[PDB]
Design an enzyme around this catalytic site. Sequence first.
Site, PDB file in Angstrom:
ATOM      1  N   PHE A  11       0.827  -1.200   0.000  1.00 45.55           N
ATOM      2  CA  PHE A  11       0.000   0.000   0.000  1.00 45.55           C
ATOM      3  C   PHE A  11       0.869   1.260   0.000  1.00 45.55           C
ATOM      4  CE2 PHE A  11      -2.085   2.633   3.589  1.00 45.55           C
ATOM      5  CZ  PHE A  11      -2.599   3.588   2.738  1.00 45.55           C
ATOM      6  N   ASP A  31       9.902  -7.035  -3.087  1.00 46.90           N
ATOM      7  CA  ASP A  31       8.753  -7.580  -2.385  1.00 46.90           C
ATOM      8  C   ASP A  31       8.703  -9.090  -2.601  1.00 46.90           C
ATOM      9  OD1 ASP A  31       5.823  -7.833  -1.413  1.00 46.90           O
ATOM     10  OD2 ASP A  31       6.203  -5.662  -1.339  1.00 46.90           O
ATOM     11  N   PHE A  33       5.474 -10.539  -1.919  1.00 43.02           N
ATOM     12  CA  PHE A  33       4.028 -10.677  -2.062  1.00 43.02           C
ATOM     13  C   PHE A  33       3.386 -11.382  -0.863  1.00 43.02           C
ATOM     14  CE2 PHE A  33       5.479 -10.432  -6.565  1.00 43.02           C
ATOM     15  CZ  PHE A  33       4.855  -9.254  -6.919  1.00 43.02           C
ATOM     16  N   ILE A  81       2.703  -6.782   9.028  1.00 44.29           N
ATOM     17  CA  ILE A  81       2.088  -5.509   9.374  1.00 44.29           C
ATOM     18  C   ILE A  81       0.919  -5.670  10.353  1.00 44.29           C
ATOM     19  CG2 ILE A  81       2.847  -4.503   7.176  1.00 44.29           C
ATOM     20  CD1 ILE A  81      -0.507  -4.388   6.855  1.00 44.29           C
ATOM     21  N   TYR A 146       4.472  -7.006  17.380  1.00 44.88           N
ATOM     22  CA  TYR A 146       4.656  -6.111  16.247  1.00 44.88           C
ATOM     23  C   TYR A 146       5.389  -4.855  16.709  1.00 44.88           C
ATOM     24  CZ  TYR A 146       3.506  -2.610  12.677  1.00 44.88           C
ATOM     25  OH  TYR A 146       3.567  -1.607  11.752  1.00 44.88           O
ATOM     26  N   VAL A 189      -8.457  -0.445   8.647  1.00 47.41           N
ATOM     27  CA  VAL A 189      -9.868  -0.232   8.927  1.00 47.41           C
ATOM     28  C   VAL A 189     -10.552   0.578   7.823  1.00 47.41           C
ATOM     29  CG1 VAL A 189      -9.346   1.714  10.513  1.00 47.41           C
ATOM     30  CG2 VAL A 189     -11.544   0.500  10.707  1.00 47.41           C
ATOM     31  N   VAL A 190      -9.901   1.641   7.335  1.00 45.67           N
ATOM     32  CA  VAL A 190     -10.592   2.530   6.411  1.00 45.67           C
ATOM     33  C   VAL A 190     -10.955   1.761   5.144  1.00 45.67           C
ATOM     34  CG1 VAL A 190     -10.535   4.650   5.021  1.00 45.67           C
ATOM     35  CG2 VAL A 190      -9.650   4.694   7.355  1.00 45.67           C
ATOM     36  N   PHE A 206     -14.484  -3.047  17.280  1.00 50.02           N
ATOM     37  CA  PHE A 206     -14.071  -3.949  18.344  1.00 50.02           C
ATOM     38  C   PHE A 206     -14.321  -3.290  19.698  1.00 50.02           C
ATOM     39  CE2 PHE A 206     -11.949  -5.450  14.485  1.00 50.02           C
ATOM     40  CZ  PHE A 206     -12.449  -6.733  14.437  1.00 50.02           C
ATOM     41  N   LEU A 272      -6.800  -8.768  21.601  1.00 42.91           N
ATOM     42  CA  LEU A 272      -5.541  -8.758  22.392  1.00 42.91           C
ATOM     43  C   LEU A 272      -4.404  -8.125  21.580  1.00 42.91           C
ATOM     44  CD1 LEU A 272      -4.402  -9.785  25.168  1.00 42.91           C
ATOM     45  CD2 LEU A 272      -3.524 -11.736  23.885  1.00 42.91           C
TER      46      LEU A 272
HETATM   47  N1  LIG Z   1      -0.442   1.236   7.401  1.00 39.39           N
HETATM   48  C1  LIG Z   1      -0.169   1.887   8.519  1.00 39.39           C
HETATM   49  O1  LIG Z   1      -1.029   2.452   9.184  1.00 39.39           O
HETATM   50  C2  LIG Z   1       1.266   1.930   8.978  1.00 39.39           C
HETATM   51  C3  LIG Z   1       1.727   2.901   9.859  1.00 39.39           C
HETATM   52  C4  LIG Z   1       2.861   2.655  10.589  1.00 39.39           C
HETATM   53  C5  LIG Z   1       3.681   1.633  10.185  1.00 39.39           C
HETATM   54  N2  LIG Z   1       3.425   0.969   9.044  1.00 39.39           N
HETATM   55  C6  LIG Z   1       4.527   0.284   8.319  1.00 39.39           C
HETATM   56  O2  LIG Z   1       4.520   0.720   6.969  1.00 39.39           O
HETATM   57  C7  LIG Z   1       5.035  -0.327   6.116  1.00 39.39           C
HETATM   58  C8  LIG Z   1       4.119  -0.518   4.931  1.00 39.39           C
HETATM   59  O3  LIG Z   1       2.934  -1.237   5.339  1.00 39.39           O
HETATM   60  P1  LIG Z   1       1.571  -1.073   4.520  1.00 39.39           P
HETATM   61  O4  LIG Z   1       0.583  -0.329   5.340  1.00 39.39           O
HETATM   62  O5  LIG Z   1       1.870  -0.548   3.160  1.00 39.39           O
HETATM   63  O6  LIG Z   1       1.129  -2.604   4.403  1.00 39.39           O
HETATM   64  P2  LIG Z   1       1.333  -3.673   3.229  1.00 39.39           P
HETATM   65  O7  LIG Z   1       1.134  -5.037   3.776  1.00 39.39           O
HETATM   66  O8  LIG Z   1       0.502  -3.236   2.079  1.00 39.39           O
HETATM   67  O9  LIG Z   1       2.873  -3.452   2.878  1.00 39.39           O
HETATM   68  C9  LIG Z   1       3.887  -4.351   3.381  1.00 39.39           C
HETATM   69  C10 LIG Z   1       4.642  -4.923   2.210  1.00 39.39           C
HETATM   70  O10 LIG Z   1       5.794  -5.666   2.687  1.00 39.39           O
HETATM   71  C11 LIG Z   1       5.897  -6.852   1.942  1.00 39.39           C
HETATM   72  N3  LIG Z   1       6.653  -7.839   2.700  1.00 39.39           N
HETATM   73  C12 LIG Z   1       6.290  -8.412   3.890  1.00 39.39           C
HETATM   74  N4  LIG Z   1       7.155  -9.287   4.328  1.00 39.39           N
HETATM   75  C13 LIG Z   1       8.148  -9.306   3.363  1.00 39.39           C
HETATM   76  C14 LIG Z   1       9.346 -10.038   3.250  1.00 39.39           C
HETATM   77  N5  LIG Z   1       9.756 -10.935   4.139  1.00 39.39           N
HETATM   78  N6  LIG Z   1      10.104  -9.822   2.150  1.00 39.39           N
HETATM   79  C15 LIG Z   1       9.687  -8.923   1.255  1.00 39.39           C
HETATM   80  N7  LIG Z   1       8.588  -8.177   1.259  1.00 39.39           N
HETATM   81  C16 LIG Z   1       7.849  -8.416   2.351  1.00 39.39           C
HETATM   82  C17 LIG Z   1       4.453  -7.255   1.680  1.00 39.39           C
HETATM   83  O11 LIG Z   1       4.335  -8.212   0.653  1.00 39.39           O
HETATM   84  C18 LIG Z   1       3.849  -5.894   1.321  1.00 39.39           C
HETATM   85  O12 LIG Z   1       4.011  -5.583  -0.056  1.00 39.39           O
HETATM   86  C19 LIG Z   1       5.233  -1.549   7.024  1.00 39.39           C
HETATM   87  O13 LIG Z   1       6.589  -1.640   7.437  1.00 39.39           O
HETATM   88  C20 LIG Z   1       4.321  -1.219   8.208  1.00 39.39           C
HETATM   89  O14 LIG Z   1       4.690  -1.911   9.386  1.00 39.39           O
HETATM   90  C21 LIG Z   1       2.154   0.961   8.537  1.00 39.39           C
HETATM   91  C1  LIG Z   2      -2.403   2.338  17.268  1.00 37.13           C
HETATM   92  C2  LIG Z   2      -1.564   1.357  16.511  1.00 37.13           C
HETATM   93  O1  LIG Z   2      -1.052   0.390  17.056  1.00 37.13           O
HETATM   94  N1  LIG Z   2      -1.406   1.600  15.211  1.00 37.13           N
HETATM   95  C3  LIG Z   2      -0.607   0.773  14.332  1.00 37.13           C
HETATM   96  C4  LIG Z   2      -1.345  -0.506  13.918  1.00 37.13           C
HETATM   97  O2  LIG Z   2      -2.627  -0.159  13.483  1.00 37.13           O
HETATM   98  P1  LIG Z   2      -3.946  -0.881  14.015  1.00 37.13           P
HETATM   99  O3  LIG Z   2      -3.637  -2.291  14.365  1.00 37.13           O
HETATM  100  O4  LIG Z   2      -4.558  -0.025  15.064  1.00 37.13           O
HETATM  101  O5  LIG Z   2      -4.879  -0.835  12.718  1.00 37.13           O
HETATM  102  P2  LIG Z   2      -6.235  -1.572  12.306  1.00 37.13           P
HETATM  103  O6  LIG Z   2      -6.652  -1.088  10.965  1.00 37.13           O
HETATM  104  O7  LIG Z   2      -6.054  -3.034  12.483  1.00 37.13           O
HETATM  105  O8  LIG Z   2      -7.254  -1.030  13.405  1.00 37.13           O
HETATM  106  C5  LIG Z   2      -7.348   0.394  13.633  1.00 37.13           C
HETATM  107  C6  LIG Z   2      -8.564   0.684  14.474  1.00 37.13           C
HETATM  108  O9  LIG Z   2      -9.762   0.367  13.723  1.00 37.13           O
HETATM  109  C7  LIG Z   2     -10.585  -0.511  14.455  1.00 37.13           C
HETATM  110  N2  LIG Z   2     -11.181  -1.477  13.520  1.00 37.13           N
HETATM  111  C8  LIG Z   2     -10.401  -2.227  12.677  1.00 37.13           C
HETATM  112  C9  LIG Z   2     -10.920  -3.104  11.807  1.00 37.13           C
HETATM  113  C10 LIG Z   2     -12.340  -3.283  11.749  1.00 37.13           C
HETATM  114  O10 LIG Z   2     -12.939  -4.056  11.006  1.00 37.13           O
HETATM  115  N3  LIG Z   2     -13.056  -2.496  12.624  1.00 37.13           N
HETATM  116  C11 LIG Z   2     -12.557  -1.590  13.517  1.00 37.13           C
HETATM  117  O11 LIG Z   2     -13.281  -0.937  14.254  1.00 37.13           O
HETATM  118  C12 LIG Z   2      -9.705  -1.175  15.511  1.00 37.13           C
HETATM  119  O12 LIG Z   2     -10.509  -1.531  16.613  1.00 37.13           O
HETATM  120  C13 LIG Z   2      -8.671  -0.080  15.805  1.00 37.13           C
HETATM  121  O13 LIG Z   2      -9.049   0.804  16.851  1.00 37.13           O
HETATM  122  O14 LIG Z   2      -0.680  -1.248  12.914  1.00 37.13           O
HETATM  123  C14 LIG Z   2      -0.433  -0.482  11.721  1.00 37.13           C
HETATM  124  C15 LIG Z   2       0.165  -1.423  10.705  1.00 37.13           C
HETATM  125  O15 LIG Z   2      -0.757  -2.422  10.317  1.00 37.13           O
HETATM  126  C16 LIG Z   2       0.491   0.678  12.068  1.00 37.13           C
HETATM  127  O16 LIG Z   2       1.714   0.168  12.586  1.00 37.13           O
HETATM  128  C17 LIG Z   2      -0.168   1.574  13.109  1.00 37.13           C
HETATM  129  O17 LIG Z   2       0.718   2.603  13.517  1.00 37.13           O
END
Ligand SMILES: NC(=O)c1ccc[n+]([C@@H]2O[C@H](COP(=O)([O-])OP(=O)(O)OC[C@H]3O[C@@H](n4cnc5c(N)ncnc54)[C@H](O)[C@@H]3O)[C@@H](O)[C@H]2O)c1
Ligand SMILES: CC(=O)N[C@H]1[C@@H](OP(=O)(O)OP(=O)(O)OC[C@H]2O[C@@H](n3ccc(=O)[nH]c3=O)[C@H](O)[C@@H]2O)O[C@H](CO)[C@H](O)[C@@H]1O
Lengths: 310, 312
Positions: A11, A31, A33, A81, A146, A189-190, A206, A272
């Site tokens: 993403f 990647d 996948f 993730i 995580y 979630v979004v 939740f 949890l």
């Molecule tokens: N989405 C959020 O809210 C958020 C915010 C804070 C942290 N992050 C971090 O941002 C980064 C991007 O996550 P995202 O939201 O795009 O999710 P995502 O799952 O779409 O992106 C993660 C990507 O990493 C790849 N990947 C996983 N394990 C791998 C491996 N062993 N080798 C190679 N590729 C691998 C997956 O295939 C995927 O393309 C992650 O490091 C995540 O922890 C996400």
């Molecule tokens: C606060 C926190 O730890 N945030 C981290 C965590 O997000 P989160 O694990 O918080 O993200 P999530 O999308 O799993 O949930 C976010 C929020 O949405 C709510 N929810 C989710 C799904 C659903 O069907 N309904 C619903 O209500 C859930 O209860 C939570 O309060 O992991 C992400 C990566 O994946 C990032 O690392 C974020 O920084």
Amino acid sequence: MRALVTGAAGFIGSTLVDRLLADGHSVVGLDNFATGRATNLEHLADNSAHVFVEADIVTADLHAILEQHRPEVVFHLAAQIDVRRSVADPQFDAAVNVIGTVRLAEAARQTGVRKIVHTSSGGSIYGTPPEYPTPETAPTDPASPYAAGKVAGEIYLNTFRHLYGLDCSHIAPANVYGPRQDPHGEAGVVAIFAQALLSGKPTRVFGDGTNTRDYVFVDDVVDAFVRVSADVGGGLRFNIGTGKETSDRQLHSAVAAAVGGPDDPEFHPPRLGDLKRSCLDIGLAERVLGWRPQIELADGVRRTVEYFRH
Amino acid sequence: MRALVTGAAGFIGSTLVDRLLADGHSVVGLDNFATGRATNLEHLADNSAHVFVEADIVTADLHAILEQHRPEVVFHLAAQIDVRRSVADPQFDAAVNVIGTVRLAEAARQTGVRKIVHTSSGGSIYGTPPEYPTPETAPTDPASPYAAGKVAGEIYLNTFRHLYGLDCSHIAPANVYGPRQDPHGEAGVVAIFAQALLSGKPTRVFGDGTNTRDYVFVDDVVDAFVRVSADVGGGLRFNIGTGKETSDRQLHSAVAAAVGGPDDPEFHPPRLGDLKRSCLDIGLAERVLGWRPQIELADGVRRTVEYFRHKH
Ligand SMILES: NC(=O)c1ccc[n+]([C@@H]2O[C@H](COP(=O)([O-])OP(=O)(O)OC[C@H]3O[C@@H](n4cnc5c(N)ncnc54)[C@H](O)[C@@H]3O)[C@@H](O)[C@H]2O)c1
Ligand SMILES: CC(=O)N[C@H]1[C@@H](OP(=O)(O)OP(=O)(O)OC[C@H]2O[C@@H](n3ccc(=O)[nH]c3=O)[C@H](O)[C@@H]2O)O[C@H](CO)[C@H](O)[C@@H]1O
Ligand SMILES: NC(=O)c1ccc[n+]([C@@H]2O[C@H](COP(=O)([O-])OP(=O)(O)OC[C@H]3O[C@@H](n4cnc5c(N)ncnc54)[C@H](O)[C@@H]3O)[C@@H](O)[C@H]2O)c1
Ligand SMILES: CC(=O)N[C@H]1[C@@H](OP(=O)(O)OP(=O)(O)OC[C@H]2O[C@@H](n3ccc(=O)[nH]c3=O)[C@H](O)[C@@H]2O)O[C@H](CO)[C@H](O)[C@@H]1O
């Protein structure tokens, strides 16, 4: 610059690739996948400045890959993730988020890479913090595997910085949303909301729905990556977010309003590992990098919903 | 109580096993002999209060081992211990010290373990702090993969405490020395010096020989493990040292004195990943556990050199 983006089929990663290309860089996407989708990158099939490498950061020969492509900056977004999965299998999560990061740094230090921009987790690393919004000066206190691996990742990269002068910065986003976020994941979630409501399928929150998160739009997060790739913020973490808290129930109501249709989520048991609240102080990023979030949630929700409508 | 000691065939681990047995506990020892020695445990062959399991913490079914033995406390001393080796292969070090620890915690939380006493590294985790002696409130700043992994293990155990109420404390020793320390090891300056000086082989210090460490005797370290095993200091790290600095050069002189004969080391270039200075503030351990070190370097070096004599 010559960039390499791990997690490029993901993403945030595919969005970063796009931005780096648009700014005129060459980009190597990497990647395996695990959670990424080829569909996120298919628009790049004939893109002259992109090349993709299918590899597992935990087990691939990252030395050879880096030796070949000689990236100046590695944007490190590859990770397990899902918080809940990290609870169910803490070993797998650690292998990808800690061991993967270590192998990457060890390859990078030996291939003249200038800087690794690491992705930490602003949302989770602080656990339950002393105050909201939370500054980077707050102590880390992970309450999921995580979260712990993300902290470990920062520490290791700082160590490589000491040893070899391999520079690093830690981008620590809150909760990132926008187009390309997997609607079929169990995190994001979004996108989960948007897809289900558009298709008239059931949704849930939740616990009692009062959990807050800090929702920050993907384009904003990507700009932060770009800014920090320069010679700035060495060994430093940057919280990337909005400083605004939105409840699960409030989020649902907003997505249902954009999609039109009912606002009646099911309430399921608490998960949890999930923190109740998250709000980030983003002052440091504003001063050091000139970074500020441009997209408010109402706007972001509309853009995300219109991406899923098609 | 029932105790399990990982790293049990090692220097500190075998000593701990001895203490726990003497205290009337039943003890499961676990080791893969990466750095350990059969001779460290050979005296326990006929002791029915001790069971030994050969297991690699990285790959063994720790769940099944813990399910079988049901330890109340796990003392976690199994680790890759060499700073230089951690620099040469950070992946291997991370697998043992982080992954291994995670695997143990995941097994312990499913098998009714009350507490894990982790072994951190008070010597290395702080890096170059502004304070010496260094208190636990000082921010960690590892400058080697070994130290990074030790910190990472603390954090994971803290995480498991939050998630499952699996209690933990982190014993964070300085530079530990005494009987059973491998004389042919890559790490362990006191043992290195005693073996070389007792058999008239060359010796070296690094840099200009002004590096300092805080040398603490194994028996004192083992006592701290015992004290922290109770329902006390949950979630906390405890520095275990003497709060006194000895330079590489001074240690050489002290061992030379105890052995007899010459005090003339070679001077070799500094080693990548090695800190120049280390000294622990031990006040928290005193206030919370009632722990104080009993053995001063001079007495401890003499004891150690004696051990090396009886071992021809
Ligand atoms: N989405 C959020 O809210 C958020 C915010 C804070 C942290 N992050 C971090 O941002 C980064 C991007 O996550 P995202 O939201 O795009 O999710 P995502 O799952 O779409 O992106 C993660 C990507 O990493 C790849 N990947 C996983 N394990 C791998 C491996 N062993 N080798 C190679 N590729 C691998 C997956 O295939 C995927 O393309 C992650 O490091 C995540 O922890 C996400
Ligand atoms: C606060 C926190 O730890 N945030 C981290 C965590 O997000 P989160 O694990 O918080 O993200 P999530 O999308 O799993 O949930 C976010 C929020 O949405 C709510 N929810 C989710 C799904 C659903 O069907 N309904 C619903 O209500 C859930 O209860 C939570 O309060 O992991 C992400 C990566 O994946 C990032 O690392 C974020 O920084
Ligand atoms: N010796 C010191 O000065 C000192 C001070 C601070 C921290 N420590 C820590 O104290 C502990 C004990 O170290 P020591 O000085 O007794 O060294 P040691 O090498 O004698 O003991 C470590 C033991 O762990 C075992 N081990 C290693 N990897 C293993 C694996 N994958 N599976 C199972 N067993 C494994 C080794 O075989 C060995 O018996 C370690 O955790 C070390 O990092 C040592
Ligand atoms: C400061 C620090 O990080 N301490 C940790 C580190 O000890 P060290 O890596 O410092 O242990 P070591 O015995 O290898 O070195 C101790 C001291 O002796 C010196 N030296 C060593 C060998 C020799 O032949 N001549 C000589 O002079 C060396 O320069 C150093 O100042 O790792 C240990 C485990 O192995 C423990 O975790 C210690 O807490």
